[PDB]
Symmetry: D2
Subunit: 261 residues, 4 copies
């Protein structure tokens, strides 16, 4: 099939990439970085996040593989030594695919712009204080004042979501999780405090009250949006598909990353 | 159909119960507290929890209704004024049923005993320090030392789980959530810290290392178990069925209970 | 004595200010906004913070008073109705003074710039990731990666510090408190997690490792510093002096602000 | 001077104890376990806590030393290899003493009983729910419902207090810190949430409202008190005196214990 390989850029990743292409060369495998069916990421989770967004418009025609040259990642969870063993099983085929849920973000102006996130999407204070109205399925849930909010995919719960006190969710759960960044809670302002886990079809809407500029981030892409009036969060109908070749369970990936490998 | 009504016991609850039975008397409705199809709880969530466990062996043949005489509850979410309106719609039928997931607990000795929880099941220090090995789908995940652990149903996440830093989960999500009670984390002991959200079929096993006595609780039932060697947690295959007669969404119930009614 | 009055600017604050000046006019009191001995703030804590920094170079020659026209504040803790009673006791004299500790921030370049904070001073990510080395009395304590850090005065612990999980400290304690903003903790990065309470003479130093630009804030003043190599935190030798005229204890101020007035 | 040595009891601690007594034998040093001036603890912090309470009635006539045979402790912070070097400097004298603050607990019945804590004193649910009124300097601050409360000395903030979210306090600060154990916070019940740091002379009083039985703990001593009506917490006037022979600063002890030795 068509394949391509992206690299962190350092000497170790570029050289493992050149060795896999060489191993791939002796097969019915064509390197193609326009319409690949297999996207291999060599580096870290950030390298994988770049690879995902590089091909977010062909998600249903692509299986992703992550190779970590540094420490173990959650998307780059195969080490370099098995790359030669990886070439072989990628060549024949015959491998199950694993699908993780994604988060859809809709940003409306006064036109709109949608985005797709693998880790999380965050909304932040543009310069002055951050006050937004939180609306859940068209019901006003709370008026939030603080540093910002974070809406996380299941696989993203080990990322920014974990640092904000969120729960770690197994990626087979089609859900999204909202966490607060340093909220005020006094006699004037009241927020729920706890992280909120939303299922499919539930729409969380963030609406400004005073300022209308915000720092909106989607994974590592962070741009300041102007003249916004709504940020809609929703479990996407699209999924990211991983090529699977042996059992590396999620809770084991959590154990190795946070307890001790 | 067969029905029965349980009461908190105070003057207000006993009298609303006697008025609903009177309203029920003028219908094709027989009061029966052995094999009811409709179980009405008058009082609070605790009164409802008692009503659930009173009939946990006929869960698939029962629809539950909760009436709160005091503050708003999450299971007792209809106020007394609509009880007369409640009698009518219960009499004809024609009402959708709502199903919430339950948590199954298995306790093994050296025989075994299983239990069913609507809120949560907790395991606690029997007197000396609490040390248990946490095993997820037969993999050793961590060695926990602290005050105890709490495994919560979705509808239970607003109860004890919320006080322990857990996330609030919408009850349509078939899952269970584990939270820590005051764990030690130093160079010797290491725990994940974050709450963990597990899907169906995932089995969390708690295994003792030193002492084998524990305070195990299931909802308000808390008994000390002796000579245990395993506590297994798992999303139950059974569900609790609620009689539904109008839209009182979960996130609104959360708003009214924690933000301001 | 010399006095001056600052106002939030709205109609209510400007008019209470004009009435106190009128009441002050019938006394041996001269309005002077260059070298006052009494600085009255009318509005909120933010109005008081502006009044403090407006006169931070004459702290030992000034007693501060706060009047809240809106909700109760921690520095603006007298309501408008007692302003006429306030005029009288300010005129005669004979009132004890209360002193709260301040936080000193030193920012070095490659010259230096020092600052004085009543609430807190925070250091934040300038655009890229935030990584700093934390040094306590010239010992390397930890390498922090996250959103930022917050060093709070005692009276500031109810402000930003409280939202970040810090402890509330009685202002008679000459100390400063450091809290983390969303830190990463995995096999690579390790931070203490808990808030740290430092006494007098203890110097906490923040040193960059990669980027050298930071968003440094001091109370509501937030400016981006360039080419920094050290941010030093230390309990200041200066104190803010409040004019006291009746007992409004701190823990009562906490109760009224966060429990219910 | 008079001295004595206590041991964890295992083979390693008993044998290091017998070697120090031998080294002590060749000096103007008399082993005396009734009125020692030097109390050496060999084992861990728990062994040291037992040694402190064994002599809490002669605190002002005793200097304490801790030797850790296992991992590094906060009171047992010298390793066995320097015990022979420890014998010499203990023999001559000429060493500064370090003093840490203690926490005084008063428990009243309907007579009273006072206690002294080096780490913390906790109050817990006796069997039924835990509800107490929190009173600060004779003002009603809050009505707490939850698992319990913990009042910690400065040196105790790295113990149970740290697991409950409290701040780490340098032991030169004469203070005490209160933290909550899993409190309920809804429209009915309201607690401050944040840890509270109290100075000298401040009296925190816990008063029951419904049940009057409680599990009160002081360090590792935990006994159930009956017919109580008040638990008073206060920074003690007594201090524990440590024999100091080189610089092992507190924040370094924190670094080595929680970051990495
Ligand atoms: C440049 N990164 C790429 C990546 C990744 C990333 N994704 C995940 C994930 N899904 N589960 C766990 N670990 C993850 N990683 C690691 O996390 C660190 C920060 O990159 C790195 O070790 C990553 O690892 P690797 O790239 O060094 O191999 C942007 C991301 O950073 C997250 N993020 C931002 N701010 C904070 C913060 N304050 N605290 C914690 N996380 C934060 C956020 O989610 C964003 O998408
Ligand atoms: C006697 N109760 C019955 C009930 C209920 C209960 N269930 C829920 C729920 N699912 N979502 C939210 N609120 C809930 N409620 C309320 O919670 C308080 C404590 O009953 C009361 O107001 C309840 O309300 P109502 O009875 O006064 O109307 C035992 C339960 O207490 C929980 N629990 C135990 N210890 C703690 C603690 N330390 N912190 C918080 N919750 C705790 C635990 O889950 C247990 O099953
Ligand atoms: C514009 N403010 C002025 C003030 C004041 C301020 N100081 C204090 C204080 N010492 N103890 C308690 N309450 C305080 N207040 C209130 O706090 C809210 C935010 O102003 C307002 O109600 C204040 O009240 P009043 O102005 O509406 O009357 C900047 C400050 O905001 C703090 N701050 C910034 N970001 C956050 C955040 N994410 N969460 C919580 N606090 C934050 C920070 O400390 C900064 O100095
Ligand atoms: C039997 N212990 C003796 C000791 C000591 C103790 N004191 C301190 C301290 N001041 N600073 C930091 N570390 C400390 N240690 C360690 O802490 C662990 C638990 O002993 C052990 O490693 C201790 O170490 P060492 O004995 O193995 O060498 C009772 C104490 O346990 C604390 N405690 C109780 N319950 C919990 C909990 N749920 N979480 C955390 N701490 C708890 C409480 O404070 C009590 O006085």
């Amino acid at each position: 099939m068509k394949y391509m390989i992206t690299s962190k850029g350092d000497e170790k990743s570029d050289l493992l990439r050149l060795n896999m292409i060489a191993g791939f060369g002796e097969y019915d495998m064509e390197y193609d970085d326009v319409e690949p069916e297999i996207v291999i990421s060599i580096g870290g989770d950030g390298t994988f996040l770049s690879a995902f967004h590089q091909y977010e418009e062909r998600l249903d025609e692509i299986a992703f593989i992550g190779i970590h040259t540094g420490h173990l990642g959650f998307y780059a969870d195969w080490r370099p030594a098995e790359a030669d063993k990886l070439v072989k099983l990628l060549a024949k085929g015959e491998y199950q695919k694993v699908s993780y849920p994604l988060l859809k973000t809709t940003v409306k102006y006064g036109k709109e712009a949608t985005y797709l996130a693998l880790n999380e999407s965050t909304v932040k204070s543009s310069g002055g204080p951050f006050v937004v109205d939180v609306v859940i399925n068209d019901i006003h849930f709370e008026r939030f004042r603080g540093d910002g909010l974070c809406m996380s995919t299941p696989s993203g719960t080990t990322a920014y979501n974990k640092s904000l006190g969120g729960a770690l969710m197994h990626p087979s759960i089609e859900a999204m999780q909202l966490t607060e960044m340093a909220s005020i809670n006094n006699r004037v302002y009241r927020t729920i405090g706890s992280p909120l886990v939303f299922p499919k079809h539930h729409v969380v809407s963030l609406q400004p009250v005073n300022d209308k500029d915000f720092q909106i981030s989607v994974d590592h892409l962070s741009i300041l949006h102007r003249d916004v009036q709504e940020i809609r969060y929703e479990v996407s109908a699209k999924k990211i598909h991983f090529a699977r070749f042996r059992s590396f369970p999620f809770w084991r990936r959590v154990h190795d990353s946070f307890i001790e490998d």
